[PDB]
Amino acid sequence: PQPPDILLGPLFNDVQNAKLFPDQKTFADAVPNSDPLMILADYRMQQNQSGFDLRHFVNVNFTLPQSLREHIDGLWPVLTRSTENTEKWDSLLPLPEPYVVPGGRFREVYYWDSYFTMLGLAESGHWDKVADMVANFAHEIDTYGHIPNGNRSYYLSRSQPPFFALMVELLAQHEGDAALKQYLPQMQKEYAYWMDGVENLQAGQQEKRVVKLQDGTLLNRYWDDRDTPRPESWVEDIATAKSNPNRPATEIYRDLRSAAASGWDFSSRWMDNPQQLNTLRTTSIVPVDLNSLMFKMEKILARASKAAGDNAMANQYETLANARQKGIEKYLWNDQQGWYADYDLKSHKVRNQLTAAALFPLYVNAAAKDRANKMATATKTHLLQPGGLNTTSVKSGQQWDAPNGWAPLQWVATEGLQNYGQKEVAMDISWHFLTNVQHTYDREKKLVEKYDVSTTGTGGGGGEYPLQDGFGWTNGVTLKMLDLICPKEQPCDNVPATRP
Ligand SMILES: OCC1=C[C@H](N[C@H]2C[C@H](CO)[C@@H](O)[C@H](O)[C@H]2O)[C@H](O)[C@@H](O)[C@@H]1O
């Protein structure tokens, strides 16, 4: 499958640049009614004729795309899609089983979203859907060599935060070690993708998603194999590169795509100047969340191997995990500030900024106990707000920043804090975010993609597209949290005004 900019060449550029549709993702998801080569020969003939209408040419040649608890349960069918077969030349990639999409403009499965959605499904006893989704991701691993950002041809050149091993662990909570052993080959295969290029890597060098520091420490980074505009945000990325003539455009395209591989598209976290997206430099930053996830993946791989009966392999994975933990503790802790943070390959130091990503070492149990206590303090002091956990302390105009609260980060933070007995802060995050979700639901009768955490009752904003409704990981995380804040004796269908 070729991404639409390659498949439809000059025509794709021209349709996007003409802005025939208010969302750039629209034409990226359009299906050619006939062979692209034919539509392209045709376009070359007509395009310069008197009174040629581009829009008309496109219409002819393409097909274009109750309680809180009750509401979430009724949404699952609306968010479920089944696409075992796909039309010829569709950007949508086929999957063997039904899958849940986030909602709105997101009409395909997403990698990291699905873990948090599956948490909700698992909590509701929809273990069949959870099995189906693990199977879908295993299929993509075998088919593409890795999990794409989503099941679209324009997502094949990148991944997303790697939650597959955690999904397999989720499935094992129901099916036992049999699930770990079943999906071991695909977990190893995903690991080999993340580590591709390590062989022959020298100190001080990076290759694809692997970074080797000057002392030999191996860590990973986000990376996309392409350095061109994103088809799904074509005119935005061109405008971003055009606005900064002092950088090669390919470098800007690479970092835009890599921030998209990071899940945090976009954030002051990646930028020299928090008010200029054209300064982002994702590929020179070693992310603390990614490397926390890699640690977890290595720990899960060791467990699966040992269950499977392969002890030499289990010992290898445990040794790799032990080394990664030493790297996180050394390069991804900011000792001057007292919090985890990303590492800057440009300055050769730990970056200053506190973001919600700094909770990930707690989430995966990599963190030292004293650093976990320090993180509880940093969270209360800087990130915890009336409507939930702030993403950063910086209002950049981007969506992965203040004042936005994102469901997946609320879950990572509360689970992380609980892993170290920091129960008070963990409960405050859950209660604040849930109240926000409930309040917005009382107002709008919906769940949304992200929330403004400075108060409760309003959805968030920022970035290159409008606030989306649904919404997969909000619904999944909400159900999980709802079930935990109320006793099993008396479960709640709405978030209550009093803590029990
Ligand atoms: O809910 C799906 C998502 C959409 C958001 N990003 C997608 C939309 C971008 C176009 O607006 C796309 O380039 C990116 O790769 C996609 O993952 C969000 O920031 C992601 O963390 C999230 O997984």
Coordinates of C-alpha atoms and ligand atoms in Angstrom, one line a residue:
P1 CA 0.0 0.0 0.0
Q2 CA 1.4 3.4 -1.0
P3 CA 0.5 6.6 0.9
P4 CA -1.9 8.9 -1.0
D5 CA 0.8 11.5 -1.9
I6 CA 2.8 8.8 -3.7
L7 CA -0.2 6.9 -5.1
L8 CA -1.9 10.1 -6.4
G9 CA 1.3 12.2 -7.0
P10 CA 0.7 15.7 -8.5
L11 CA -3.2 15.5 -8.0
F12 CA -3.0 14.9 -4.3
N13 CA -0.7 17.9 -3.8
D14 CA -3.1 20.0 -5.9
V15 CA -6.3 18.9 -4.1
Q16 CA -4.8 19.4 -0.7
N17 CA -3.3 22.8 -1.6
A18 CA -6.6 23.9 -3.2
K19 CA -8.2 23.2 0.2
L20 CA -11.4 21.8 -1.4
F21 CA -12.2 20.3 2.0
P22 CA -12.0 22.0 5.5
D23 CA -10.0 19.0 6.9
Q24 CA -6.8 17.8 5.2
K25 CA -7.5 14.3 6.4
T26 CA -10.7 14.2 4.1
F27 CA -8.9 13.7 0.8
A28 CA -6.3 11.6 2.5
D29 CA -9.1 9.1 3.2
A30 CA -10.7 9.4 -0.3
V31 CA -11.0 6.2 -2.4
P32 CA -10.1 6.3 -6.2
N33 CA -13.0 5.0 -8.3
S34 CA -10.5 3.6 -10.8
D35 CA -6.8 2.9 -11.2
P36 CA -4.7 5.9 -9.9
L37 CA -2.5 5.7 -13.1
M38 CA -5.6 6.2 -15.2
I39 CA -7.0 9.1 -13.1
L40 CA -3.5 10.7 -13.2
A41 CA -3.2 10.4 -17.0
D42 CA -6.7 11.9 -17.3
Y43 CA -5.9 14.8 -14.9
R44 CA -2.7 15.6 -16.9
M45 CA -4.8 15.9 -20.0
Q46 CA -7.6 18.1 -18.5
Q47 CA -5.8 20.2 -15.9
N48 CA -4.7 22.9 -18.3
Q49 CA -7.8 23.0 -20.5
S50 CA -10.1 26.1 -20.4
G51 CA -12.7 25.9 -17.6
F52 CA -11.3 22.8 -15.9
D53 CA -12.9 22.4 -12.5
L54 CA -10.7 20.5 -10.0
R55 CA -13.6 19.9 -7.5
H56 CA -15.8 18.4 -10.2
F57 CA -12.8 16.2 -11.3
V58 CA -12.5 14.9 -7.7
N59 CA -16.3 14.2 -7.2
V60 CA -16.3 12.1 -10.4
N61 CA -13.1 10.2 -9.7
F62 CA -13.2 9.6 -5.9
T63 CA -15.5 8.4 -3.1
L64 CA -15.0 10.7 -0.1
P65 CA -15.5 9.6 3.5
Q66 CA -29.2 8.3 30.8
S67 CA -26.3 7.9 33.1
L68 CA -22.6 8.4 32.3
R69 CA -22.1 4.6 32.5
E70 CA -25.1 3.8 30.2
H71 CA -23.9 6.4 27.7
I72 CA -20.4 4.8 27.4
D73 CA -21.8 1.2 27.1
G74 CA -24.1 2.4 24.2
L75 CA -21.2 4.1 22.5
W76 CA -19.1 0.9 21.9
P77 CA -21.2 -0.2 18.9
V78 CA -21.1 3.3 17.4
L79 CA -17.3 3.4 17.7
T80 CA -16.9 -0.2 16.4
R81 CA -15.9 -0.8 12.7
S82 CA -15.3 -4.0 10.8
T83 CA -13.1 -3.9 7.7
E84 CA -11.8 -7.3 6.8
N85 CA -11.8 -6.3 3.2
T86 CA -11.2 -2.9 1.7
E87 CA -11.8 -1.4 -1.7
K88 CA -8.8 -1.2 -4.1
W89 CA -6.7 1.9 -3.5
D90 CA -8.4 2.8 -0.1
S91 CA -5.9 4.4 2.4
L92 CA -7.7 2.3 5.1
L93 CA -5.8 -0.9 5.8
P94 CA -7.7 -4.1 6.4
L95 CA -7.8 -5.9 9.8
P96 CA -9.0 -9.4 10.5
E97 CA -11.3 -8.5 13.5
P98 CA -13.7 -5.7 14.5
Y99 CA -12.0 -2.7 16.2
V100 CA -13.0 0.4 18.1
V101 CA -12.0 3.8 16.6
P102 CA -11.6 7.0 18.8
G103 CA -14.5 9.0 17.1
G104 CA -15.1 12.0 14.9
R105 CA -12.5 12.5 12.2
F106 CA -10.6 9.5 13.6
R107 CA -12.2 6.7 11.6
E108 CA -9.4 4.2 12.0
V109 CA -7.8 2.3 14.9
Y110 CA -5.0 4.1 16.8
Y111 CA -2.1 2.3 18.6
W112 CA -1.9 3.9 22.0
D113 CA -5.6 4.9 22.2
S114 CA -6.6 1.2 21.9
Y115 CA -4.8 0.2 25.1
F116 CA -6.9 2.7 27.2
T117 CA -10.1 1.8 25.3
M118 CA -9.4 -1.9 25.9
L119 CA -9.1 -1.0 29.7
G120 CA -12.8 0.1 29.5
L121 CA -13.8 -2.9 27.4
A122 CA -12.1 -5.3 29.9
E123 CA -13.8 -3.6 32.8
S124 CA -17.1 -4.1 31.1
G125 CA -16.4 -7.8 30.5
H126 CA -16.1 -7.3 26.8
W127 CA -13.1 -9.6 26.8
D128 CA -14.0 -10.9 23.3
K129 CA -13.4 -7.4 21.9
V130 CA -10.2 -7.2 23.9
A131 CA -9.0 -10.6 22.3
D132 CA -10.1 -9.2 18.9
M133 CA -7.9 -6.1 19.3
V134 CA -4.8 -7.9 20.5
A135 CA -5.3 -10.2 17.4
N136 CA -5.6 -7.1 15.1
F137 CA -2.3 -5.6 16.5
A138 CA -0.5 -9.0 16.2
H139 CA -1.6 -9.1 12.6
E140 CA -0.2 -5.6 11.9
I141 CA 3.1 -6.6 13.5
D142 CA 3.3 -9.7 11.3
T143 CA 2.1 -7.8 8.2
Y144 CA 4.1 -4.5 8.4
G145 CA 6.9 -5.4 10.9
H146 CA 5.5 -3.0 13.4
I147 CA 2.3 -1.3 14.7
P148 CA 1.5 1.7 12.5
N149 CA 0.3 5.0 14.1
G150 CA -3.1 3.7 12.8
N151 CA -4.5 1.4 10.0
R152 CA -4.0 4.0 7.2
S153 CA -1.3 3.9 4.5
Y154 CA -0.1 7.3 5.6
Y155 CA 0.7 5.9 9.1
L156 CA 2.9 3.1 7.8
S157 CA 6.2 5.0 8.1
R158 CA 5.8 5.4 11.9
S159 CA 4.5 3.8 15.1
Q160 CA 3.1 5.3 18.3
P161 CA 3.9 4.9 22.1
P162 CA 4.4 1.1 22.3
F163 CA 1.6 -0.3 24.4
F164 CA 1.4 -3.8 22.6
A165 CA 3.2 -5.7 25.4
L166 CA 0.9 -4.0 27.9
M167 CA -2.1 -5.0 25.8
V168 CA -0.9 -8.6 25.9
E169 CA -0.5 -8.3 29.7
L170 CA -4.1 -7.0 29.9
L171 CA -5.4 -10.0 28.0
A172 CA -3.4 -12.3 30.3
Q173 CA -5.3 -10.9 33.3
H174 CA -8.2 -12.8 31.9
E175 CA -6.6 -15.7 29.9
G176 CA -3.5 -16.4 32.1
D177 CA 0.0 -16.8 30.8
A178 CA -1.4 -18.5 27.7
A179 CA -1.9 -15.0 26.2
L180 CA 1.7 -14.0 27.0
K181 CA 3.1 -17.2 25.3
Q182 CA 0.7 -16.9 22.3
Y183 CA 1.9 -13.4 21.5
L184 CA 5.6 -13.7 22.4
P185 CA 6.6 -13.9 18.7
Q186 CA 4.9 -10.7 17.8
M187 CA 6.3 -9.0 21.0
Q188 CA 9.8 -10.0 20.0
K189 CA 9.0 -8.7 16.4
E190 CA 7.9 -5.3 17.7
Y191 CA 11.0 -5.2 20.0
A192 CA 13.2 -5.8 16.9
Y193 CA 11.6 -2.9 15.2
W194 CA 12.3 -0.5 18.1
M195 CA 15.9 -1.8 18.2
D196 CA 16.5 -1.9 14.5
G197 CA 19.9 -0.3 13.8
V198 CA 21.5 -1.0 17.2
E199 CA 23.8 -3.5 15.4
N200 CA 27.0 -1.6 14.5
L201 CA 25.8 1.5 16.4
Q202 CA 28.7 3.3 17.9
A203 CA 28.8 5.6 21.0
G204 CA 27.3 9.1 20.4
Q205 CA 25.3 7.9 17.4
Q206 CA 21.6 7.5 16.5
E207 CA 19.9 5.3 13.9
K208 CA 16.1 5.2 13.3
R209 CA 14.5 4.7 16.8
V210 CA 17.7 3.8 18.6
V211 CA 20.1 6.2 20.4
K212 CA 23.4 5.1 21.8
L213 CA 24.9 7.7 24.2
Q214 CA 28.6 8.6 24.6
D215 CA 29.1 6.1 27.5
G216 CA 27.3 3.4 25.5
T217 CA 23.9 3.6 27.1
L218 CA 21.2 2.4 24.7
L219 CA 17.8 4.2 24.7
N220 CA 15.1 4.8 22.1
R221 CA 13.6 7.9 20.4
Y222 CA 10.5 8.6 18.2
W223 CA 11.3 8.5 14.4
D224 CA 9.4 8.4 11.2
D225 CA 11.0 6.8 8.0
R226 CA 9.7 9.7 5.9
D227 CA 10.8 13.4 5.8
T228 CA 8.0 14.8 3.6
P229 CA 4.7 16.6 4.6
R230 CA 2.1 14.4 6.3
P231 CA -0.6 13.6 3.7
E232 CA -3.3 14.0 6.4
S233 CA -2.0 17.5 7.3
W234 CA -0.4 18.4 4.0
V235 CA -0.9 22.2 3.9
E236 CA -0.2 22.7 7.7
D237 CA 3.2 21.0 7.5
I238 CA 4.2 22.9 4.3
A239 CA 3.2 26.2 6.0
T240 CA 5.2 25.2 9.1
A241 CA 8.4 24.5 7.1
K242 CA 7.9 27.6 5.0
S243 CA 7.7 29.8 8.1
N244 CA 11.3 28.7 9.2
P245 CA 13.8 29.3 6.3
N246 CA 16.8 28.7 8.7
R247 CA 16.0 25.0 8.9
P248 CA 16.1 22.4 6.1
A249 CA 12.4 21.6 5.4
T250 CA 13.1 17.8 5.5
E251 CA 14.3 18.2 9.0
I252 CA 11.1 20.0 10.0
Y253 CA 9.0 17.3 8.3
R254 CA 10.9 14.6 10.0
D255 CA 10.3 16.2 13.5
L256 CA 6.6 16.9 12.8
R257 CA 6.1 13.2 11.8
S258 CA 8.2 12.1 14.8
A259 CA 6.1 14.2 17.3
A260 CA 3.1 12.4 15.6
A261 CA 4.9 9.0 16.4
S262 CA 5.3 10.3 20.0
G263 CA 1.5 10.7 20.5
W264 CA 2.2 14.2 21.6
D265 CA 1.3 16.1 18.4
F266 CA 2.0 18.8 19.3
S267 CA 3.7 20.1 22.4
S268 CA 6.1 22.7 23.9
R269 CA 7.9 19.5 25.1
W270 CA 9.6 19.2 21.7
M271 CA 10.1 22.9 20.9
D272 CA 13.0 25.4 21.6
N273 CA 10.4 28.2 21.3
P274 CA 7.0 27.2 22.9
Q275 CA 5.2 29.7 20.7
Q276 CA 6.7 28.4 17.4
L277 CA 5.9 24.9 16.1
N278 CA 8.6 25.5 13.5
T279 CA 11.3 25.1 16.2
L280 CA 10.2 21.5 17.3
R281 CA 13.0 19.0 17.3
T282 CA 11.6 15.6 18.4
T283 CA 14.4 13.5 16.8
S284 CA 17.1 15.1 19.0
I285 CA 15.2 14.4 22.3
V286 CA 15.3 11.1 24.2
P287 CA 11.7 10.8 25.6
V288 CA 11.2 9.6 29.2
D289 CA 7.8 8.0 28.5
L290 CA 9.0 6.0 25.5
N291 CA 12.0 4.6 27.4
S292 CA 9.7 3.8 30.4
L293 CA 7.6 1.8 28.0
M294 CA 10.6 0.1 26.5
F295 CA 11.6 -1.0 30.0
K296 CA 8.1 -2.4 30.6
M297 CA 8.3 -4.2 27.2
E298 CA 11.6 -5.9 28.1
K299 CA 10.2 -6.9 31.6
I300 CA 7.1 -8.4 29.9
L301 CA 9.3 -10.2 27.2
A302 CA 11.3 -11.7 30.1
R303 CA 8.1 -12.9 31.8
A304 CA 6.7 -14.3 28.6
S305 CA 9.9 -16.1 27.7
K306 CA 10.2 -17.6 31.2
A307 CA 6.5 -18.7 31.0
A308 CA 7.2 -20.2 27.5
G309 CA 10.2 -22.2 28.9
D310 CA 13.0 -20.2 27.3
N311 CA 15.3 -19.3 30.2
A312 CA 18.3 -18.0 28.2
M313 CA 15.9 -15.6 26.6
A314 CA 14.2 -14.6 29.8
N315 CA 17.7 -13.8 31.4
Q316 CA 18.6 -11.8 28.3
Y317 CA 15.5 -9.6 28.5
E318 CA 15.9 -9.1 32.2
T319 CA 19.5 -8.0 31.7
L320 CA 18.4 -5.5 28.9
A321 CA 15.7 -4.2 31.3
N322 CA 18.2 -3.7 34.1
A323 CA 20.4 -1.7 31.8
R324 CA 17.5 0.4 30.6
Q325 CA 16.5 1.2 34.1
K326 CA 20.1 2.5 34.9
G327 CA 19.9 4.7 31.7
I328 CA 16.5 6.2 32.8
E329 CA 17.8 6.9 36.3
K330 CA 21.0 8.5 34.9
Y331 CA 19.8 10.4 31.8
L332 CA 16.1 10.9 32.3
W333 CA 16.2 12.4 35.9
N334 CA 16.7 16.1 36.3
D335 CA 18.5 16.3 39.7
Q336 CA 18.6 20.2 39.8
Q337 CA 14.7 20.3 39.5
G338 CA 13.8 17.0 41.2
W339 CA 11.7 15.4 38.4
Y340 CA 12.0 13.0 35.5
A341 CA 12.4 14.7 32.1
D342 CA 13.6 14.1 28.6
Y343 CA 17.3 14.1 27.5
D344 CA 18.6 16.6 25.0
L345 CA 20.9 15.1 22.4
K346 CA 21.9 18.7 21.3
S347 CA 23.2 20.0 24.6
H348 CA 24.0 16.6 26.1
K349 CA 21.9 17.2 29.1
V350 CA 18.6 16.5 30.8
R351 CA 15.9 19.0 29.8
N352 CA 14.3 21.4 32.3
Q353 CA 10.6 21.1 31.6
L354 CA 8.2 19.2 33.8
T355 CA 5.5 17.4 31.7
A356 CA 3.1 14.6 32.6
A357 CA 5.5 12.2 30.8
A358 CA 7.6 12.4 34.0
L359 CA 5.1 10.0 35.7
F360 CA 5.9 7.1 33.3
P361 CA 8.9 5.8 35.3
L362 CA 6.5 5.3 38.2
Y363 CA 3.8 3.7 35.9
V364 CA 6.3 1.0 34.8
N365 CA 8.0 0.6 38.2
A366 CA 11.4 1.8 37.0
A367 CA 11.6 4.7 39.5
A368 CA 13.5 4.7 42.8
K369 CA 11.2 5.0 45.8
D370 CA 12.6 8.5 46.7
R371 CA 12.2 9.7 43.2
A372 CA 8.6 8.5 43.2
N373 CA 8.0 10.5 46.4
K374 CA 9.6 13.5 44.7
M375 CA 7.3 13.0 41.7
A376 CA 4.1 13.0 43.9
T377 CA 5.3 16.3 45.3
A378 CA 6.0 17.7 41.7
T379 CA 2.5 16.6 40.7
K380 CA 0.7 18.3 43.6
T381 CA 2.8 21.4 43.3
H382 CA 2.8 21.9 39.5
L383 CA 0.4 19.6 37.5
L384 CA -2.7 18.8 39.6
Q385 CA -5.5 21.2 38.8
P386 CA -9.2 21.5 39.6
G387 CA -10.3 19.5 36.5
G388 CA -7.5 16.9 36.4
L389 CA -3.8 16.5 35.7
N390 CA -2.3 19.2 33.5
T391 CA -0.2 18.0 30.5
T392 CA 2.4 20.7 31.0
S393 CA 2.6 24.1 32.8
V394 CA 2.9 25.9 29.4
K395 CA 0.0 27.3 27.3
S396 CA 1.5 27.1 23.9
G397 CA -1.7 27.0 21.8
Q398 CA -0.9 23.3 21.1
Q399 CA -3.1 20.5 22.4
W400 CA -0.5 18.5 24.4
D401 CA 0.1 21.4 26.8
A402 CA -1.7 23.4 29.4
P403 CA -4.6 23.8 30.0
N404 CA -5.5 20.4 28.5
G405 CA -6.0 17.2 30.5
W406 CA -5.9 13.9 28.5
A407 CA -7.5 10.7 29.8
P408 CA -4.4 8.4 29.1
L409 CA -2.2 10.7 31.1
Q410 CA -4.7 10.7 34.1
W411 CA -4.5 6.9 34.0
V412 CA -0.7 6.6 33.7
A413 CA -0.3 9.2 36.6
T414 CA -2.8 7.5 39.0
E415 CA -1.5 4.0 38.3
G416 CA 2.1 5.2 38.6
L417 CA 1.4 7.0 41.9
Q418 CA -0.5 4.0 43.3
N419 CA 2.5 1.7 42.4
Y420 CA 4.4 3.6 45.1
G421 CA 1.6 4.0 47.7
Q422 CA 0.9 7.7 46.9
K423 CA -2.8 7.1 47.2
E424 CA -3.9 10.6 48.1
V425 CA -2.5 12.3 45.0
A426 CA -3.7 9.4 42.9
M427 CA -7.3 9.8 44.2
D428 CA -7.3 13.6 43.8
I429 CA -6.3 13.2 40.1
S430 CA -9.1 10.6 39.5
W431 CA -11.7 12.5 41.3
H432 CA -10.8 15.9 39.6
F433 CA -10.7 14.3 36.1
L434 CA -13.9 12.3 36.6
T435 CA -15.8 15.4 38.0
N436 CA -14.7 17.2 34.9
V437 CA -15.9 14.3 32.6
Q438 CA -19.2 14.1 34.5
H439 CA -19.7 17.9 34.5
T440 CA -19.1 18.1 30.7
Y441 CA -21.4 15.2 30.2
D442 CA -24.2 16.9 32.3
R443 CA -23.7 20.0 30.1
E444 CA -23.1 18.6 26.6
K445 CA -24.4 15.0 26.8
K446 CA -21.1 13.7 25.5
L447 CA -17.5 12.7 26.2
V448 CA -14.7 14.5 24.4
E449 CA -11.0 14.0 23.3
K450 CA -9.5 16.2 26.0
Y451 CA -10.6 18.5 28.8
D452 CA -9.7 22.0 30.1
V453 CA -8.4 21.2 33.6
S454 CA -8.2 24.7 35.0
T455 CA -12.0 24.2 35.8
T456 CA -14.5 21.5 35.2
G457 CA -17.2 21.1 32.5
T458 CA -15.4 22.3 29.4
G459 CA -13.5 20.4 26.7
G460 CA -10.0 21.4 25.7
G461 CA -8.7 22.9 22.4
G462 CA -5.5 23.9 20.6
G463 CA -3.6 22.5 17.7
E464 CA -4.5 21.9 14.0
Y465 CA -8.0 20.4 14.3
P466 CA -11.2 21.0 16.4
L467 CA -12.1 19.2 19.6
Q468 CA -13.4 15.7 18.8
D469 CA -16.3 13.8 20.4
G470 CA -16.7 10.1 21.4
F471 CA -14.2 9.3 22.6
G472 CA -12.3 6.0 22.9
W473 CA -9.7 6.5 25.6
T474 CA -11.9 9.0 27.6
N475 CA -14.7 6.4 27.7
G476 CA -12.3 3.6 28.5
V477 CA -10.4 5.5 31.3
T478 CA -13.7 6.9 32.7
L479 CA -15.2 3.4 33.1
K480 CA -12.0 2.1 34.7
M481 CA -11.8 5.0 37.2
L482 CA -15.6 5.1 37.8
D483 CA -15.4 1.4 38.9
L484 CA -12.5 2.2 41.3
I485 CA -13.8 5.3 43.1
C486 CA -17.0 3.6 44.3
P487 CA -17.1 0.4 46.5
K488 CA -18.1 -2.9 44.7
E489 CA -21.0 -3.1 47.2
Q490 CA -22.5 0.1 45.7
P491 CA -21.2 0.8 42.2
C492 CA -22.0 4.3 40.7
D493 CA -23.5 5.0 37.3
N494 CA -22.6 8.7 37.5
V495 CA -19.6 10.4 39.3
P496 CA -21.0 11.3 42.8
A497 CA -20.7 14.8 44.4
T498 CA -19.4 13.1 47.6
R499 CA -16.5 10.7 47.9
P500 CA -17.7 7.5 49.6
Ligands
LIG1 O1 -7.1 9.8 19.1 C1 -6.3 9.6 18.0 C2 -5.2 10.6 18.2 C3 -5.2 11.7 17.4 C4 -4.1 12.8 17.6 N1 -3.1 12.6 16.5 C5 -3.5 12.1 15.2 C6 -3.9 13.2 14.2 C7 -2.8 13.8 13.3 C8 -3.4 14.7 12.2 O2 -4.2 15.8 12.9 C9 -1.9 12.7 12.7 O3 -0.9 13.3 11.9 C10 -1.3 11.9 13.8 O4 -0.4 10.9 13.3 C11 -2.5 11.1 14.5 O5 -2.0 10.2 15.5 C12 -3.5 12.7 19.0 O6 -2.5 13.7 19.2 C13 -3.0 11.3 19.2 O7 -2.2 11.1 20.4 C14 -4.1 10.3 19.3 O8 -3.6 9.0 19.2

